[PDB]
Amino acid sequence: VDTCSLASPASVCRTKHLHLRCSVDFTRRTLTGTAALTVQSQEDNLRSLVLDTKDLTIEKVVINGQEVKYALGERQSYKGSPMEISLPIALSKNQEIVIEISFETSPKSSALQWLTPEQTSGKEHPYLFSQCQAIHCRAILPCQDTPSVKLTYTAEVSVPKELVALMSAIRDGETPDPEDPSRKIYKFIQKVPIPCYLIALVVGALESRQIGPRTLVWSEKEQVEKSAYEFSETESMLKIAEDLGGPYVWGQYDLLVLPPSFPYGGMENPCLTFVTPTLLAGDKSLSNVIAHEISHSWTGNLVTNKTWDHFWLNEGHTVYLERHICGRLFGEKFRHFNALGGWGELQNSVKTFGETHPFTKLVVDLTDIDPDVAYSSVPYEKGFALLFYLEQLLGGPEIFLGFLKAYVEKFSYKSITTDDWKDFLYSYFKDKVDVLNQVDWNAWLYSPGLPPIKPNYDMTLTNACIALSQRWITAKEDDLNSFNATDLKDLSSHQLNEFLAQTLQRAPLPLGHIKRMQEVYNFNAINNSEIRFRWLRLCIQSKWEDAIPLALKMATEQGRMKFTRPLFKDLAAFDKSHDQAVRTYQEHKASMHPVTAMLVGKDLKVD
Ligand SMILES: CN(C)c1ccc(C(=O)NCCCCCCC(=O)NO)cc1
Ligand SMILES: [Yb+3]
Numbered sequence: 249v250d251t252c253s254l255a256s257p258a259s260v261c262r263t264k265h266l267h268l269r270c271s272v273d274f275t276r277r278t279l280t281g282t283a284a285l286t287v288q289s290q291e292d293n294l295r296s297l298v299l300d301t302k303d304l305t306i307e308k309v310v311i312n313g314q315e316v317k318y319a320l321g322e323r324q325s326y327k328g329s330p331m332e333i334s335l336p337i338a339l340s341k342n343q344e345i346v347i348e349i350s351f352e353t354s355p356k357s358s359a360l361q362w363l364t365p366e367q368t369s370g371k372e373h374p375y376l377f378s379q380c381q382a383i384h385c386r387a388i389l390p391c392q393d394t395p396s397v398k399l400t401y402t403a404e405v406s407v408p409k410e411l412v413a414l415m416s417a418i419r420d421g422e423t424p425d426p427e428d429p430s431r432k433i434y435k436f437i438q439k440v441p442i443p444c445y446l447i448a449l450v451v452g453a454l455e456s457r458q459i460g461p462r463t464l465v466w467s468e469k470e471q472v473e474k475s476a477y478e479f480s481e482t483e484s485m486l487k488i489a490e491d492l493g494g495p496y497v498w499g500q501y502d503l504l505v506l507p508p509s510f511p512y513g514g515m516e517n518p519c520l521t522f523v524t525p526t527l528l529a530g531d532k533s534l535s536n537v538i539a540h541e542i543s544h545s546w547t548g549n550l551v552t553n554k555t556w557d558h559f560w561l562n563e564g565h566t567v568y569l570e571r572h573i574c575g576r577l578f579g580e581k582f583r584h585f586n587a588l589g590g591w592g593e594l595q596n597s598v599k600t601f602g603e604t605h606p607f608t609k610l611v612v613d614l615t616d617i618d619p620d621v622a623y624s625s626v627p628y629e630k631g632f633a634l635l636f637y638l639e640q641l642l643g644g645p646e647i648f649l650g651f652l653k654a655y656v657e658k659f660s661y662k663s664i665t666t667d668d669w670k671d672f673l674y675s676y677f678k679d680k681v682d683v684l685n686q687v688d689w690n691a692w693l694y695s696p697g698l699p700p701i702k703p704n705y706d707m708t709l710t711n712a713c714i715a716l717s718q719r720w721i722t723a724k725e726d727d728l729n730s731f732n733a734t735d736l737k738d739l740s741s742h743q744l745n746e747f748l749a750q751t752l753q754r755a756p757l758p759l760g761h762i763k764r765m766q767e768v769y770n771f772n773a774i775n776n777s778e779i780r781f782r783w784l785r786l787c788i789q790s791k792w793e794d795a796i797p798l799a800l801k802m803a804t805e806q807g808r809m810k811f812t813r814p815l816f817k818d819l820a821a822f823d824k825s826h827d828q829a830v831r832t833y834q835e836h837k838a839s840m841h842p843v844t845a846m847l848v849g850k851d852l853k854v855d
């Protein structure tokens with residue numbers, strides 16, 4: 249049972265298919281139409297069922313041509329309102345019916361952000377995009393909003409004819425809208441069963457450019473050129489992933505580069521990965537986010553977490569798989585560099601939450617907690633650490649990659665728990681039980697804090713970052729003169745990023761140090777979003793007032809939560825910036841993504 253869903257669970261009935269027909273109305277900021285769910289009974293004498301909804305207006309519910317009775321429960325906060333539907337005939341086990349629900353979303357749907365023309369690149373057209381993971385699909389349409397159920401889907405989306413709709417599906421044609429010649433209808437088919445958190449929709453002035461045999465990059469016109477460059481490794485990454493995980497089953501792999509307020513680095517919507525434009529560094533150095541999303545086509549989209557309590561299964565294995573893709577592209581020493589960095593990030597999260605915090609457990613209990621509130625690097629990096637540890641315990645990456653491929657084949661098209669994974673692990677490594685049985689499973693899976701064992705990391709590419717960081721940390725005033733732009737000559741962009749992360753762990757530094765750093769390195773001029781984020785955190789935590797406008801601007805000119813939340817928090821913790829941070833949030837909040845608006849408010853202890 250899925251503590252985050254209010255719907256009938258899979259033991260009662262399962263949605264097999266969705267046919268969505270909707271119209272996007274930028275005036276009223278609503279999606280309007282019909283969600284026809286083919287539902288299979290899993291019980292004898294099934295007479296009613298419950299769906300998830302969130303701020304939906306239900307117009308009617310039709311089964312075999314007739315309106316049927318339904319009622320909406322009391323809103324249960326971020327869970328929304330359960331909707332009980334009375335079936336007109338009782339269903340036997342395995343019997344399937346179609347339930348046609350007419351509905352309209354609210355302008356305040358937590359799944360959606362509606363952008364005015366001035367919020368887009370082009371300035372002439374508005375824009376809409378969705379983000380359903382974890383539990384926002386219910387705010388677009390009535391569903392069993394739980395990853396324990398997988399369905400296929402078809403859709404027809406009516407939009408102003410000057411715009412383009414895309415979804416997490418194969419494009420199946422466009423036509424003028426028969427009802428309305430100022431409109432176009434775009435068609436979509438997803439033949440592979442998916443959890444409903446993978447439903448996605450974007451509408452805007454989108455253009456496309458081919459960048460691989462099964463990849464087009466979509467964006468507003470202003471970003472297409474840089475995007476085609478930035479993500480040019482996509483096909484080579486997909487070929488590697490296929491080698492590691494088995495056949496890519498989804499057909500197309502397109503990319504969509506969103507406007508700056510998209511809340512996440514990437515989202516692995518099937519057939520159409522959504523990415524932040526803050527990936528656009530000019531040198532492909534942030535493309536590991538693409539390798540990550542690619543990897544979810546196996547770990548998460550094919551084999552899926554049964555409830556959000558088991559999110560690590562999705563994220564940890566994806567980080568594991570993407571670090572392999574990076575290692576295949578650039579070398580094992582690079583794989584180690586990224587893994588060791590990911591340990592640093594785990595250390596950071598644990599210090600931030602605190603070493604006893606229940607959300608520092610690998611497997612968590614989400615009863616009564618908004619998954620967006622509890623979201624952090626933990627399931628990613630503690631998840632990965634477990635896997636990298638097991639890799640080294642069981643005889644190395646080649647051996648563990650056989651397990652990973654077999655694990656994907658075994659649970660393709662299914663939704664599973666941590667016990668399913670662990671059971672299969674023991675099964676595959678039957679001949680190595682004695683080694684597995686030395687693992688402290690209770691602490692790894694269920695204890696808070698850092699894991700009980702640290703894996704072994706190659707240091708080769710990290711040493712230079714550490715050395716330059718330790719020079720700055722151990723420097724006194726009369727050593728500042730010895731730093732010079734030549735210090736960076738031999739560092740890659742990743743190493744620069746890792747130098748900054750090492751240094752930021754020891755923040756604050758003295759203000760004269762941070763001043764000298766800008767004097768000699770000009771970090772203010774770097775466009776790399778990761779590097780600039782860490783440089784700006786270091787400056788604010790080290791109380792440099794000059795950085796305040798830069799950090800405010802970065803927090804607001806884009807909205808990827810990974811950057812926007814810590815920057816607003818740092819700025820709120822700095823007495824010289826506190827009020828301006830609060831007021832800037834208060835000024836921007838109407839125009840932010842609803843989820844990011846919400847969390848930034850909590851983080852700032854405002855309203
Ligand atoms: C266990 N727990 C506390 C949570 C579980 C799931 C989420 C979630 O799905 N959040 C939405 C994630 C969207 C994508 C993040 C970037 C990513 O991994 N892309 O692949 C949140 C918290
Ligand atoms: Yb019966």
Ligand SMILES: [Zn+2]
Pocket residue numbers: 540544563566
């Ligand atoms: Zn992910």
